[PDB]
Design a protein around this ligand. Structure first.
Ligand SMILES: Nc1ncnc2c1ncn2[C@@H]1O[C@H](COP(=O)(O)OP(=O)(O)OP(=O)(O)O)[C@@H](O)[C@H]1O
Ligand SMILES: Nc1ncnc2c1ncn2[C@@H]1O[C@H](COP(=O)(O)OP(=O)(O)OP(=O)(O)O)[C@@H](O)[C@H]1O
Lengths: 131, 247, 359, 322, 122, 72, 120, 73
């Protein structure tokens, strides 16, 4: 009843199943794709991608990437995607405390970017572990 | 053994028959000779055998021959002590053997009676000058096909027949059918297997194997060759296995 | 069949009445133990048993005979004892008097069993007297008629001819190898003479598997004709699966990165090995071992842990023998593994699995 | 006790042969699984490279100026090396570390300020025991190389680059091209062409002869590999994609996918090549243990016959002396 | 060494020690050529515990203090059972192998481990 | 071996070289087992180093002896 | 073979030759089953040096000119000592093993190595 | 030279008249085919040949003598 959706991580096809309404965490801001969308190619940010199974609104946990919209056949190329919820948030807070700790420790200009990416990914890890 | 050899030599010499002298374990003949020499007090030979080992053996093996009248052919069971072929009982037994048939527990278990190993069996007769160039080359091609199958069993175990090359897959199928065609129903094993038993001469043998080895009998199942003789019976069993499918 | 009570014997190396089976092994591997378990398992059957103790220590014979009297296997047993202080003549004559007694009982229409414990000691006694009579020796100073000594004795073990009385005398000689030299003189003699051989391994004995039967090298030339019809069915699957396990055993350290079927066959073999283990002087009845082989070979114990297979099987055998005597009666009277016996066994397996997962 | 210790030595050689053929067969299974992994990770990079080629053609007139395509010609250098995780490797890790020595010997001459990122276990052990080399990070094969190892490597090298500390991040790995031979290659990684084509250490577009999707087939009765050129690639067409993001920021959010995909592809190739070297080494060791077992059995039969002969001769000598 | 003579605890601990030593002896050639590192997770624990058992079987004799250069120790049966049960329980996995060499009982093993750690640190 | 043992030694040599043969045999077994070990402990490396220093010390030119105090 | 009879230089060179040959003989069975790829760097260097030594031990004989050809060579003691000092000292470490096989006087080994590399 | 007719022998193991050359191998590896080749090769040369069969089976001697007779040696 909706446009086809596929998430592709570098090694495996995650799932080739379609879901009704999808909100895309982009570099310009959260946009939602409506069925029979005109093809728009959007860049993706490290954030929260959520789906609509037409039965229950559910979230996807991705570590970044780039998504293309096709004629009801869209592709989502990511860096690392976790379908649905797989980890519980408790280990995620036990990891965010070390994340904010090692930010304080590592302050080199390259380690600046390492810890900033660690923060940007740990945050979306938690906010996708919310459900 | 000399008693049996005398009874066989009568049938050869007087009646001009072709006699088949079956010896039981010829190791126990040598062992009984070593016993009687250790009893008579003679000084033993190398690994403990009687000093008259080669001559004791020759006095038996030199009357299993072919005269102008008939021919005694002997089929002697051979036990190898300590499983080494260099012990003086096998070392002197094998100086008088012309051919060798090894019976394999593998083929006996997987139902391919007679369980003769095709590759570990030898014969000094299998030479072009003796058996004809055609017979020699078809026997060599069958041995090559079976050896390739035995080398490829592990590769097909890992990958599969769909992942081999085309010539290797054709080889694997041909070797499967050949392994199943070496089997035969016996007139003696008929009483419990039920199959009426077949006698297959050498001409029909090489003519059936030539066809199964060239690309003529490739469109047949494997179990169409199993437990038949005389490749026409294999095509008849094939037609029955195809009647089971058209029905 | 001659039931020895050891499941790994009766399924893999079956012994029949009138057959000479060799108990050959190294020292302290469990030869006397196998002999005693067979004599104790002859309790229900009307088998007159004979144990010939040749050159043993007198306290060893004392322990064996008191063990017999304790377990009640002394009412149908005779013990011929020639300890190691006896003259060589008495230790050389003792197996022949054992054979004479068993021959008396055999020709009077009774089925007998004779165990010659350490026939090697009889061979050494005969060698001693042969050397002292100044006779020409052979290999290892044995007289040239030591094979005649052993064969003239072992050929007495017969199965009579139905006009002589249908009696028989099963012979279980015991031969001790040294340093694993199966090619030694007296072991080769007895291996050539006897019907089959039953090899015991010190590596298997140390590794825990007792009785330490090396089935891959043990033979029985009598074959399945020494089994009941209920045992051949389950013994076929036991043989096939143990053979496949022996093939894949070198792959057990690489089990994780293998096919699922290969991992399944490896686990199946490694928990079929657990039901071949068996405590000393505890022989199983033929119905108990039939039910054990059935469960193990079908895979109604492919879920438990290896530290639990033996305990589960003990509880299961007790459960069946107490709750469903119809299975015992079916296997005992008809001597075949009937589909009704299969139904009773599957019901008992389900119920015992529930009762055992109740902990 | 000499014959028994001979029997035990022969038994240990039999055990050695059995375990080496087991290792050979399980290494063949793992080669097949690594090939499956490569052919499953293929289509992701296929769609990625076609998308990126089209987008760069839509961006050549533009001002893309992403740190990844940018060229910093002051030329510091960051060589990175992947090596075998586990051991015995045939001669995998030796050749890999040796070509690393060759490259650093050429580099430290020119003053290009080389440095090393070691990914394998034998590699990083070699590098810590040979402390005369600068090193940037350590990685291991305990963690699976399928996802998380390569993602961590991509993170480390991305943060190494975008903090513009070094140019010329190039990689040394060993492409599985053949069973018995696998010559390492040095491909540049980060100073990547805007088209999206992997290059060589100099950069003369060696993506032309990459020979994707190696597969294992026998030749006559022995397993070989077969490597063809082009499979299931549709790069030509590009409709109106109607971008929502910025045209340069599109490439900025895309190119890390190329980095991760190339690193993962190299890890999968070097893993398959290490397992193939292990398979051929264990085949050779099985054959050598086979001929050793044969020689041992011959020598043991000779010793047994000589022992029996000497024993009986001594016994009969004593008896005749009496 | 029969259960009815010797007690089930003694019989079972003796059986487990013998099985660990036999498994280690059978793993010997797969170690001695192919590498102790590549070993599985269960065989590494087997090798470690079997080396600890091999060291712990040794004992200084009162009559052999001229050879061992150390005082001899008498070890009762219960302390032997308890020490080997500790070793192959998995809780003494932290002591060095040489902490089990030529010690009387398992408290001497732990004291020698402590002393070795002190020598290694300062 | 020596069946007489440290009783054939002065008290100085008993004091310094009483436990040495058994520790040298244990080092020999340890060094044998560490040939097929990839990663090593620091205490194991130190024991190996001590064993090798002692093995270098054990050497003697022919007809060039040490006294008891030099041995100590 | 004593430092007082043949001198200390001869004695030390003979000792070092026998030491590397003994190390080679030790690891012979391991390198027979597994191969050279598994040895350490120092063990591989010792293997290569032991192979060069066992090739430089062979020599053409005047009485065996029919079997080998390449007529016999007489080598003094000083030349043998210098050649083995050169092999074990690591100088002649980058030339083929076959350059040492059936020659005398290691300058001939160097001549043979140059001839082999120029002939390819 | 004493030519055997076999290329390998005459090229790499040359035998002269007056030399004791041993033919050593396993069973059924040749040595009698080789001996008979050398004897059948002496047709033109002025060389007497002696062949002693010391323990062979009588059928082997029969084959050798009939081959000699047929080929004219
Ligand atoms: N199935 C078994 N389960 C447990 N222990 C066993 C088993 N079989 C034998 N043993 C043990 O093995 C030990 C030696 O067994 P046994 O004396 O039967 O072997 P043996 O070879 O006859 O000995 P010997 O070599 O002295 O004649 C005994 O202590 C016995 O308890
Ligand atoms: N050059 C050859 N070409 C073809 N066939 C050969 C050749 N040499 C030997 N054969 C065959 O090999 C078989 C054995 O050869 P040959 O008779 O020379 O060995 P042998 O001396 O009999 O061995 P043994 O005497 O130990 O049995 C013979 O049947 C012969 O036909």
């Amino acid at each position: 009843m909706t446009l086809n959706l596929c998430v592709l991580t570098p090694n495996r096809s995650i799932w080739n199943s379609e879901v009704k309404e999808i909100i895309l965490s982009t570099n310009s801001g959260q946009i939602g794709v409506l069925p029979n969308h005109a093809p728009t190619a959007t860049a993706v940010d490290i954030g929260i991608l959520r789906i609509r199974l037409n039965d229950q609104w559910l979230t996807l946990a991705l570590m970044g990437g780039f998504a293309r919209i096709g004629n009801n056949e869209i592709t989502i190329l990511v860096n690392d995607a976790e379908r649905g919820s797989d980890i519980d948030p408790q280990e995620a807070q036990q990891t965010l405390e070390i994340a904010e700790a090692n930010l304080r420790k590592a302050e080199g200009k390259r380690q600046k970017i390492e810890a900033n990416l660690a923060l940007r990914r740990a945050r979306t890890r938690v906010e996708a572990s919310n459900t | 053994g000399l008693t049996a050899l005398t009874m066989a030599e009568y049938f050869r010499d007087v009646n001009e028959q072709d006699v088949l002298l079956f010896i039981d374990n010829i190791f126990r003949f040598v062992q009984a000779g070593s016993e009687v020499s250790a009893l008579l007090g003679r000084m033993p030979s190398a690994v403990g055998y009687q000093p008259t080992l080669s001559t004791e053996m020759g006095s038996l093996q030199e009357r299993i021959t072919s005269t102008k009248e008939g021919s005694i052919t002997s089929i002697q069971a051979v036990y190898v002590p300590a499983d080494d072929l260099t012990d003086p009982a096998p070392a002197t037994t094998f100086a008088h053997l012309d051919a060798t048939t090894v019976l394999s527990r593998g083929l006996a278990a997987k139902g391919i009676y007679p369980a003769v190993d095709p590759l570990d069996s030898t014969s000094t007769m299998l030479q072009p000058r003796i058996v004809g160039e055609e017979h020699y080359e078809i026997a060599q091609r069958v041995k090559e096909t079976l050896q390739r199958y035995k080398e490829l069993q592990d590769i097909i175990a890992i990958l599969g027949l769909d992942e081999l090359s085309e010539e290797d897959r054709l080889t694997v199928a041909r070797a499967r059918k050949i392994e199943r065609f070496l089997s035969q129903p016996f007139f003696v094993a008929e009483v419990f297997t039920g199959s009426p038993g077949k006698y297959v001469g050498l001409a029909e043998t090489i003519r059936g194997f030539q066809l199964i080895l060239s690309g003529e009998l490739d469109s047949l199942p494997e179990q169409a060759f199993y437990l038949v003789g005389n490749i026409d019976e294999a095509t008849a069993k094939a037609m029955n296995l195809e009647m089971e499918s058209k029905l | 069949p001659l039931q020895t009570g050891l499941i790994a014997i009766d399924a893999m190396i079956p012994v029949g009445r009138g057959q000479r089976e060799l108990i050959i092994g190294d020292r302290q591997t469990g030869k006397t133990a196998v002999a005693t378990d067979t004599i104790l398992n002859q309790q229900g059957q009307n088998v007159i048993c004979v144990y010939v103790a040749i050159g043993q220590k007198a306290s060893s014979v004392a322990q064996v005979v008191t063990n017999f009297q304790e377990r009640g296997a002394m009412e149908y047993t005779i013990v011929v004892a020639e300890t190691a202080d006896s003259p060589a003549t008495l230790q050389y004559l003792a197996p022949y008097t054992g054979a004479a007694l068993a021959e008396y009982f055999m020709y009077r229409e009774r089925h007998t069993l004779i165990i010659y414990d350490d026939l090697s000691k009889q061979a050494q006694a005969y060698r001693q007297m042969s050397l002292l009579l100044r006779r020409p020796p052979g290999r290892e100073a044995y007289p040239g008629d030591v094979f005649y000594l052993h064969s003239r004795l072992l050929e007495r073990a017969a199965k009579l001819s139905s006009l002589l009385g249908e009696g028989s005398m099963t012979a279980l000689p015991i031969v001790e190898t040294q340093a694993g030299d199966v090619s030694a003189y007296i072991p080769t003699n007895v291996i050539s003479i006897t019907d089959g051989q039953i090899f015991l391994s010190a590596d298997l004995f140390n590794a825990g598997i007792r009785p330490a039967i090396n089935v891959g090298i043990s033979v029985s030339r009598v074959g399945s004709a020494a089994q009941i019809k209920a045992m051949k069915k389950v013994a076929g699957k036991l043989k096939l699966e143990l053979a496949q396990f022996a093939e894949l055993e070198a792959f057990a350290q690489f089990a994780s990165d293998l096919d699922k079927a290969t991992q399944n066959q490896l686990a199946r073999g490694q928990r079929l090995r657990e039901l071949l283990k068996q405590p000393q002087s505890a022989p199983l009845t033929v119905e108990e071992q039939v039910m054990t082989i059935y469960t193990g070979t079908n895979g109604y114990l492919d879920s438990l842990e290896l530290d639990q297979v033996r305990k589960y099987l003990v509880e299961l055998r007790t459960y069946v023998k107490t709750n469903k005597p119809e299975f015992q009666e079916i296997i005992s009277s008809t001597k075949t593994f009937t589909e009704e016996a299969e139904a009773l066994l599957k019901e008992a397996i389900q119920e015992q699995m529930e009762r055992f997962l109740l902990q | 006790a000499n014959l028994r210790e001979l029997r035990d030595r022969i038994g240990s050689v039999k055990n050695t042969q059995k375990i080496t053929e087991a290792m050979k067969l399980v290494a063949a299974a793992k080669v097949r699984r690594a090939q499956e992994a490569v052919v499953n990770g293929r289509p992701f990079s296929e769609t990625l490279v076609e998308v990126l080629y089209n987008m760069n053609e839509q961006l050549q007139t533009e001002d893309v100026d992403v740190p990844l395509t940018k060229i910093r010609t002051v030329k510091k250098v960051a060589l990175m090396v992947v090596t075998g995780d586990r051991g015995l490797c045939g001669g995998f890790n030796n050749m890999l570390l040796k070509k690393a020595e060759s490259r650093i010997a050429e580099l430290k001459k020119l003053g290009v300020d080389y440095t090393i990122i070691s990914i394998g276990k034998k590699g990083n052990t070699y590098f810590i025991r040979r402390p005369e080399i600068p090193v940037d990070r350590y990685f291991d094969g305990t963690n699976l190389p399928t996802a998380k190892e390569a993602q961590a490597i991509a993170d480390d090298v991305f943060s190494l680059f975008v903090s513009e500390e070094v140019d010329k991040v190039e990689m040394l790995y060993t492409k599985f091209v053949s069973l018995v031979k696998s010559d390492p290659v040095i491909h540049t990684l980060l100073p990547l062409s805007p088209k999206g084509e992997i290059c060589d250490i100099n950069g003369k577009c060696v993506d032309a002869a990459e020979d994707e999707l190696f597969r294992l087939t026998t030749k006559e009765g022995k397993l070989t590999v077969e490597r063809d050129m082009i499979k299931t690639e549709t790069p030509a067409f590009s409709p109106i994609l109607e971008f929502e993001q910025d045209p340069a920021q599109i490439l900025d959010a895309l190119l890390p996918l190329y980095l991760n995909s190339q690193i993962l592809r190299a890890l999968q190739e070097s893993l398959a090549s290490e397992l193939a070297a292990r398979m051929t080494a264990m085949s050779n060791a099985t054959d050598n243990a086979n001929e050793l077992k044969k020689t041992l059995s011959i020598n043991y039969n000779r010793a047994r016959q000589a022992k029996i002969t000497g024993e009986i001769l001594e016994i009969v000598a004593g008896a005749n002396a009496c």
